[PDB]
Symmetry: D4
């Protein structure tokens, strides 16, 4: 597996399952793990330190509220980190988004949309990255995009059949 999907809590799985779905569709081997900067800080450090050796080329990290997980991983590895802001209850993911995207100069995290759209798109982006060097994966992405496009094109009128 060349991609790891991690998240701050098991309660984030309802969101992050949409990243894993994309990888099943595109036949991308992936790791899935609950890793919390706040509740499991030492495992976070260990996970981030061993990511390259473990063969990860992209890491997708999701968290809600004061969403530190993606940034703290990015601080401890040169493996590209993609951040998914989970939709929090009070602030509807604005807290998650700001906590993730607003990284200082030197430690980037590529941030996707709040919520399930973002989880899916994080997997698609990870796939696009891997596809630069994986021609079979490149073809499969190409095919999947064409399928999305064609479905829309085949159904131009949203109204009831008549």
């Amino acid at each position: 597996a060349r991609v790891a999907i991690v998240m701050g809590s098991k309660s984030d799985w309802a969101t992050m399952q949409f990243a894993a779905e994309i990888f099943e569709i595109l036949n991308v081997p992936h790791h899935v793990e609950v890793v919390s900067a706040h509740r499991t800080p030492d495992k976070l450090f260990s996970f981030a330190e061993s990511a390259e050796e473990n063969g990860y080329q992209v890491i997708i990290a999701g968290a809600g509220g004061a969403a530190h997980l993606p940034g703290m991983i990015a601080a401890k590895t040169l493996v590209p980190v993609l951040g998914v802001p989970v939709q929090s209850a009070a602030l509807s993911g604005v807290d998650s988004l700001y906590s993730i995207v607003q990284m200082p100069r030197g430690i980037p995290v590529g941030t996707l949309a709040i919520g399930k759209a973002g989880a899916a798109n994080a997997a698609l982006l990870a796939a696009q990255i891997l596809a630069t060097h994986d021609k079979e994966l490149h073809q499969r992405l190409n095919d999947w995009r064409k399928a999305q496009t064609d479905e829309v094109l085949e159904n131009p009128d949203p109204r009831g059949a008549a």
Copy 2:
């Protein structure tokens, strides 16, 4: 020193100097250090792990933007952590505030106002905490508050002298 003041960058000093000022006024010994979760992650872990042994009873941490520093310290010590959101340029500290205050259940950070007001108030709160067991410090806080109150009371009319 029973209090440590730390911050994510030397550029935060313009703000965090107002915390140190309060400690000079109240004669509270304190440590001051640049500690970054993002740029110096290992030192953050070491600092947090050794805080109790080093004699710290309150930690004041300030950072801007994706402000992870206070929360990451709080994840690694039981010493109370107080967070100061530094006023960021684009988002005027809303990013800092959300990144600090919105901690998940289990790892608290007591958050103060955005900016220099918050830095001062973090020192005052740290002092109030210490004062529960330090009667001389308690008296000095009491005296300082009375001085603030009396100044306002002595100057009820904001208009020009006439």
Copy 3:
């Protein structure tokens, strides 16, 4: 009891019960009372004035909307005040958060997350403060944190059993 939990309305109890829960778990004696700056202003003043004599070393105060209760207590005692922003209907606690955290220089309130996460974390922070001088309580916090960490570590994969 060395901690008081107060709130602006009985309707805040749905939130503030999560602070009291933490104290039951950690065996921390505590007081619970509805105290409103707006509806019971004189009792607020009396409560704040008598807090030290009554043996309180931390006060946790929660309120929604124009959330003045924590700050008004803090104006009238040197006992540390922790503020919990209750999640209001229209503004989802942004009004509560701003009303609490944005205190002027001289009168601090250590603010926690909007909602039930914040109520819990306020109790945990109060506990961390008390634990500086209460070794048995310190051990119990330590044990509780390890239990949270270990649960996450013991359940790394959020997916269905297979």
Copy 4:
């Protein structure tokens, strides 16, 4: 004087001077005082308790950030309170506005615009209230409004003279 203008700090005078200006224009006797819920809580209570006896029929209160002053006065008198949110630095008065307008059922504060527009309009509203029973003041307001209207009507084209 049937109106009192109060504010949380002398630094608020730059804003609240625009309320006093309106009263000078309309020849309305008024009191001006720095009264802080946070720095002078006891004077706040005394001021609010004695407002009716002192002859006040409207109170205009201004404050910035965690702006508790108007609401705390309103909690302690039946004299109508009008609130002016001062434009704070970080949050540009959104904190002031929310802290003032979002009062719970039972204790109203009539809130005006953030900043100097609001200070002026608070005085005008206070004047409109008083004018219900003061025919000479009613005429003077009427005349002042006509003067504003006529100035605009007399200058329909904003372009340079030609």
Copy 5:
């Protein structure tokens, strides 16, 4: 009737009924009418022009979204106008609040909280205004406030009976 309650739509009644409730409780005669600046502009002008002659001393106006009704009434009468921001669906009354409170210098509207709290408080404020010259109404407000206070004081503990 010395107070009129108006609103932009019949759909606002769910909110504005809480203003009328207060007047029933305090025995304040009042008028209730749907008046829209957008859908009935001419009636708005007629209503505002005839308000003084019709005996109104306070007008309470409520509207949602682009909430122009209160301000447009205030532009056309010297009778004090109080504005109630109705909680809109998308923006949860932030649009309503801004549209109402942010009036330019010369034309004030005293704004209350978003939603049903605001509707009630608008009636209470209108009552406080009228009470300056209506001693029987003043007593009734005083009694009602004491009843609210006493209820809270009589029920200090929010927990289940035991």
Copy 6:
């Protein structure tokens, strides 16, 4: 003139001059006038009522803060109204934008960007509308757009000459 540019205050001219500029460039005859819903309500009604007879086919209206002008014109004429939110000081035109765009069903206002970009674009949109039936104007818009495009295309590299 088939287009009128109006604004709530002469202070809005700094912004609305960018609409007039576009009309000078495209040789579109236009009217310019300060018309305020708040300060000149009767003239607003008269202006809106006579717009069709006066030959206006688009009206561009700009205002800041509680920006009622565009919507109140739209309530009183079937001539299409385009709204320009002026950038207010405290809220940076969010108040202006919400006050303009959030119109209820039945009375539309086509809203453009906050500030000078919006003023220009309002004139361009008005021009596009008129161009549907004015072939010479259509050509001139076409030419102006090509000029903008070509300038960008002719300068692909933003770096210093070397």
Copy 7:
């Protein structure tokens, strides 16, 4: 058909159906199509390029989140474009609104309210535009507006019958 209604997804139809409703009421022939800048970019370009030839004089475009559809159409035709921000889940259409209204100088989109109110108002505005040159349509709009006004006027009291 002189108006086209397009939208980024079939899921937007729940909103955009309220635009089509207005056209049915006013007997305005219209086209309806799902056109996505993101999922069908080439069809977007083709649609925009052929709009004038196809007889469209107004285009109404709706989309949610990162709502690029209206602006990308406007970049590729001189036919006036009206934008409808669909109410997104996390951000309640603030993302949609900003993505649509905040167009740079040169490429306007006339933006309506978030959600179903906006969809209706976009159709009404399109109709007002067309009505400048379509006297029968002008009469029908006039009649429809009078019907809305009269309904409100005929039902001034929102209370229960008695």
Copy 8:
């Protein structure tokens, strides 16, 4: 060059120069071009269509306000796109951020911080991606990060020399 830096306007260069700086530091060959979805739509399509053939493995795109450029490129190529929100005047890049990050499922853009921090971090992320397969570049990133870390570690005390 395996990376292209593009932006909506020459006025964005003040921001995007910080991306190019990182590439100069790390000796990464790169292309720089003004490409606008709004002002040069056809060139955008051509650029995106030819990106893979032209040898680009990452594209960094920056734009302000209604920031469509990154997303429209991402719609037309499988080459990973990274988005930089430029800090707009009115909304301080919140419009830019929302327009970029909130992409629907299927078309991702990895978004970085508002402003110059984001531009730098976009280049660093692009570099991290390329470094997965470029060992010399990997070493250079590693060295650069160590240099940043060491500088902070070498300067722990922000206070004046004494």
